[PDB]
Design a protein around this ligand. Structure first.
Ligand SMILES: C[C@H](N)c1ccc(NC(=O)C2CC2)cc1
Length: 171
């Protein structure tokens, strides 16, 4: 059975309980914390690519109002984010299972850009999600996993200084 787990969930939970925020820039900003995933139950010899995308957790614009995040009242449908391919892709099960799969090179942007960078809507709430795609083999297969622990609001600058402080404390 394919098992997918979150490395350093303790740290993600500190950020989540304060409402996590991730900086987006026109050029694209790397994430802190980094999404790291423990994976077991892959065929060491089978071929897989690791994909990352960001689900709009709700259809609302959020705003920091008197030290608290509150949603607008005018939802719009949220077009899904683009997919980031882990640069080790494609690779053997053994490669993916020898150490946590670490998405340290994904960059979050607010502007449609060349490639690499994933465009998010500023002040929308996102839930990171991976797809483990079995490639090359006869039978293509996809397994998807969500990480509620790693939810955040995309911001152009931090609103909650509690978040600013946690980021610096642990980077
Ligand atoms: C060059 C770069 N490492 C790269 C580019 C495309 C893919 N395509 C896939 O694996 C798709 C089937 C899921 C993988 C890696």
């Amino acid at each position: 059975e394919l098992r997918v787990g979150l490395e350093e969930s303790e740290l993600w939970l500190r950020f989540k309980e304060l409402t996590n925020e991730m900086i987006v820039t026109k050029n694209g900003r790397r994430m802190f914390p980094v999404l790291k995933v423990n994976v077991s139950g892959l065929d060491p010899n089978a071929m897989y690519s690791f994909l990352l995308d960001f689900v709009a957790a709700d259809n609302h614009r959020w705003k920091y109002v008197n030290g608290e995040w509150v949603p607008g009242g005018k939802p719009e449908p949220q077009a899904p984010s683009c997919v980031y391919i882990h640069p080790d892709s494609p690779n053997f099960g053994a490669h993916w299972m020898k150490a946590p799969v670490s998405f340290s090179k994904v960059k979050l942007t607010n502007k449609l850009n060349g490639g690499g960078q994933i465009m998010l809507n500023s002040l929308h709430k996102y839930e990171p999600r991976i797809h483990i795609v079995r490639v090359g083999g006869p039978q293509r297969m996809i397994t998807s996993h969500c990480f509620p622990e790693t939810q955040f609001i995309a911001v152009t600058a931090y609103q909650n200084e509690e978040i600013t402080a946690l980021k610096i404390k642990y980077n």
